C-alpha cells in the first residue's frame, strides 16, 4: 500500500512489512532504454553518462548480493541467522528497538559495529559448512 521509501518514517515494527517495495527497485530503471532516436551517438556527452549509470546500477546491486551469498541468506528477504547479539552493540530492550525506533535511527547507532557484525556473520556460516562436511 506504500510507495518506494514510503515507510522511512514508520517504526521498525511497522516498516518491515513493506520490505519488498524497496527491494524490487535495485536494478529496474529508465536507463536501460536506448534513446529518443538512434555524430557518434554512443560517445555523446549524454551517451557516456548513460553508460556509467548502467555500471553504477549493476555494481550497487552486486554489493548487497555479495554479502547475502556469504551469509547464507541467498533467496530470502528476512533471513534468521545463528549469531548471538551480545548486547555490546546495543543494550536496548526488544520493546524499545521495534516500537519507537525507525530503520534510519537504528542503523546510525550501530553504525560503529557493522564492520564487525559483517565479519562475524560470515564466520558463523563458514563454521556451519565445515560442521556438515564431517557430519554427513
Amino acid at each position: 500500500i506504500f510507495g518506494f521509501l514510503g515507510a522511512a518514517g514508520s517504526t521498525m515494527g511497522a516498516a518491515s512489512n513493506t520490505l519488498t517495495v524497496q527491494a524490487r527497485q535495485l536494478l529496474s530503471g529508465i536507463v536501460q532504454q536506448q534513446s529518443n532516436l538512434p555524430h557518434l551517438l554512443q560517445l555523446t556527452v549524454w551517451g557516456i553518462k548513460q553508460l556509467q549509470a548502467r555500471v553504477l546500477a549493476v555494481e550497487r546491486y552486486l554489493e548487497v548480493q555479495k554479502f547475502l551469498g556469504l551469509w547464507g541468506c541467498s533467496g530470502k528477504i528476512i533471513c534468521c541467522t545463528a549469531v548471538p547479539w551480545n548486547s555490546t552493540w546495543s543494550n536496548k530492550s526488544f520493546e524499545q528497538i521495534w516500537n519507537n525506533m525507525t530503520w534510519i535511527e537504528w542503523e546510525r547507532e550501530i553504525s560503529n559495529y557493522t564492520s564487525q557484525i559483517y565479519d562475524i556473520l560470515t564466520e558463523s556460516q563458514f563454521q556451519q559448512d565445515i560442521n556438515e562436511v564431517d557430519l554427513l
Partner: protein, 472 residues
C-alpha cells in the same frame, strides 16, 4: 533479553548522502521536431509517462543548497554540450583581416510604427569592407558587410578596424541548422539512488525540511541562460522568497524568487537580410546584407504597474531581514557587458538590455500610497554577434543574423541582487541593492534547490528471536 539473535532484513528504507551520475531524460513530444537542439538533444532516454512521487510522512532531512553537487554536474553538462555543438562548425580565421569601416545610409518608411519612439539602428551599425584578390595583378575587389559597433575595434590608422576576437581566440560560426530553444531536461539517477525533494512552501536555502518526498528524477528544467533576471522558468508556491548563502556577507549574491510571473516582451523591429560569402574551400560565411525598410532600436516592453507592485512586495520581504534600513535599488555600478546589461537569447539573437528604469527607485516609509497611470516601460537593448558566453571556459561563437522580425515573450520569475557594504551609515540607515552579478550557477540553484541525491542501503541487521534451524 538473553535469547536474541542477529537477523538480516534485505530491503529496509535506509539511505545515506552520496554523489552520483545523473543521466538525462526528456519527453518525446518536445523533441522529434528534427530541429537538432543544442542542449536537450535526442540522446536523452524517453522519460516515464507517469512520474511517481512518494510522501515520507515522519521524515526530516537536512537539505543544503549552496553545497549541492547537482549544480556542478549541470554546469559541466551545459559546457560540454556547448563545446560539442560548435565543434563541426566553420572557423572564422579568414575574417581576421583589415576592415575599412564607415557610416550607414539607410532609407525607410516614415511612420515606422512610432509607438516607442526610441531611436534608429544607425550610429550602432557600420559598413565594413575588405579586399579580395583578383586575376589582374595589384587589383582588389571590395567585399561589404554590416557589423555592429560592439564587434569591431579600431587598432591604428583610423578608419581601419578589425574584429574584436582576433587577438584573444578563434571563433566558430554557429551552424544555422541547430536551434537555441531550451527544451526541458529531467535529471534521472541510476537504480539504487533516489532524489529527495522538499515540499515545504516557505523554505529557505539550508536546514531541516519536514515534508520530504521521494522522486525518481526531477521535473522539466530549462537550461535558459540570463544574467540580471532569472527568466522564463518556475514560480514559487508560498510567497516571494529571498535566499542567499549568508545575508551578512555582501560578497554573496541574493536570489529573489517570485510567486507571480511578470511578462517581458522583447522585439527587434528591424529588417535584416542575409548574404553568404565563401571563405576558404567549402566553408561559407553568413553576413548581414542590408537593412531595408523599418529601422529602429530593438526594445523590450514591460507592464509598469506589475513590476511596480512586484518591487513593492520584494521590498516588503527584504525589509524583514534588514529591519530599520530603507531599501533602494540602484542600477549596476560597472563590469563587463553581461553584468551591466541584462543579457539573454531570443530566437538565436543575443540581446543586452539596459534595465535602469526597472532598478532605480527608493522605498522610505510607505507614508502615502501614490497612485499612477497604466504605463509601459521600454528598455532599449543592443544586439551582439561575437558572443563569449562564458568568460574563459567556453568556446567563442559567431551568431549568424536571422532574417525578418524577432519577438520573444518571456516570464520574469527571479531577480539577482548584490548588496553594498556601507560602514559609517549608522545614522543614515539605507541599503542599496544592485542587479546582476553572480556566475551562471545561480541560474540553476533556482531550480535544483529542492532536490538532494541519496543512495539506498537496503541491507539491515536487527535482533529477533529467530535461531537458524541446524540441519541433522
Amino acid at each position: 533479553a538473553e535469547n536474541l539473535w542477529v537477523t538480516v532484513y534485505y530491503g529496509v528504507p535506509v539511505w545515506k548522502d552520496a554523489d552520483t551520475t545523473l543521466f538525462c531524460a526528456s519527453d518525446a513530444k518536445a523533441h522529434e521536431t528534427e530541429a537538432h537542439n543544442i542542449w536537450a538533444t535526442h540522446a536523452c532516454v524517453p522519460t516515464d509517462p507517469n512520474p511517481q512521487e512518494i510522501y515520507m510522512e515522519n521524515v526530516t532531512e537536512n537539505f543544503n543548497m549552496w553545497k549541492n553537487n547537482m549544480v556542478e554536474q549541470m554546469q559541466e553538462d551545459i559546457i560540454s554540450l556547448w563545446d560539442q555543438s560548435l565543434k563541426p562548425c566553420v572557423k572564422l580565421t579568414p575574417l581576421c583581416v583589415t576592415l575599412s569601416c564607415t557610416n550607414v545610409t539607410l532609407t525607410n518608411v516614415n511612420y515606422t510604427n512610432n509607438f516607442p519612439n526610441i531611436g534608429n539602428i544607425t550610429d550602432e551599425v557600420r559598413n565594413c569592407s575588405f579586399n579580395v584578390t583578383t586575376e589582374i595583378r595589384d587589383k582588389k575587389q571590395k567585399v561589404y558587410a554590416l557589423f555592429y559597433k560592439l564587434d569591431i575595434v579600431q587598432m591604428e590608422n583610423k578608419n581601419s578596424y578589425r574584429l574584436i576576437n582576433c587577438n584573444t581566440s578563434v571563433c566558430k560560426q554557429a551552424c544555422p541548422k541547430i536551434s537555441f530553444d531550451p527544451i526541458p531536461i529531467h535529471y534521472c539517477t541510476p537504480a539504487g539512488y533516489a532524489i529527495l525533494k522538499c515540499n515545504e512552501k516557505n523554505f529557505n536555502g539550508t536546514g531541516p525540511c519536514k515534508n520530504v518526498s521521494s522522486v525518481q528524477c526531477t521535473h522539466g528544467i530549462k537550461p535558459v541562460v540570463s544574467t540580471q533576471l532569472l527568466l522564463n522558468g518556475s514560480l514559487a508556491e508560498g510567497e516571494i522568497i529571498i535566499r542567499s548563502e549568508n545575508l551578512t556577507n555582501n560578497a554573496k549574491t541574493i536570489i529573489v524568487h517570485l510567486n507571480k510571473s511578470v511578462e517581458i516582451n522583447c522585439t527587434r523591429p528591424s529588417n535584416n537580410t542575409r548574404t553568404s560569402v565563401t571563405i576558404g574551400p567549402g566553408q561559407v560565411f553568413y553576413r548581414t546584407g542590408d537593412i531595408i525598410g523599418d529601422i529602429r532600436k530593438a526594445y523590450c516592453e514591460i507592464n509598469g504597474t506589475k513590476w511596480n507592485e512586484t518591487l513593492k512586495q520584494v521590498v516588503g520581504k527584504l525589509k524583514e531581514h534588514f529591519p530599520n534600513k530603507t531599501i533602494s535599488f540602484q542600477p549596476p555600478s560597472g563590469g563587463d557587458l553581461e553584468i551591466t546589461m541584462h543579457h539573454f537569447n531570443c530566437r538565436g539573437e543575443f540581446f543586452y538590455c539596459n534595465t535602469t528604469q526597472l532598478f532605480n527607485s527608493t522605498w522610505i516609509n510607505s507614508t502615502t500610497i501614490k497612485e499612477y497611470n497604466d504605463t509601459i516601460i521600454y528598455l532599449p537593448c543592443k544586439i551582439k554577434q561575437i558572443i563569449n558566453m562564458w568568460q574563459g571556459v567556453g568556446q567563442c561563437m559567431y551568431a549568424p543574423p536571422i532574417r525578418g522580425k524577432i519577438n520573444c515573450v518571456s516570464n520574469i520569475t527571479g531577480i539577482l541582487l548584490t548588496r553594498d557594504g556601507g560602514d559609517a551609515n549608522a545614522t543614515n540607515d539605507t541599503e542599496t541593492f544592485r542587479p546582476g552579478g553572480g556566475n551562471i550557477k545561480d541560474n540553476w540553484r533556482s531550480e535544483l534547490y529542492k532536490y538532494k541525491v541519496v543512495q539506498i542501503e537496503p541491507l539491515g541487521i536487527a535482533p529477533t528471536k529467530c535461531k537458524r534451524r541446524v540441519v541433522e
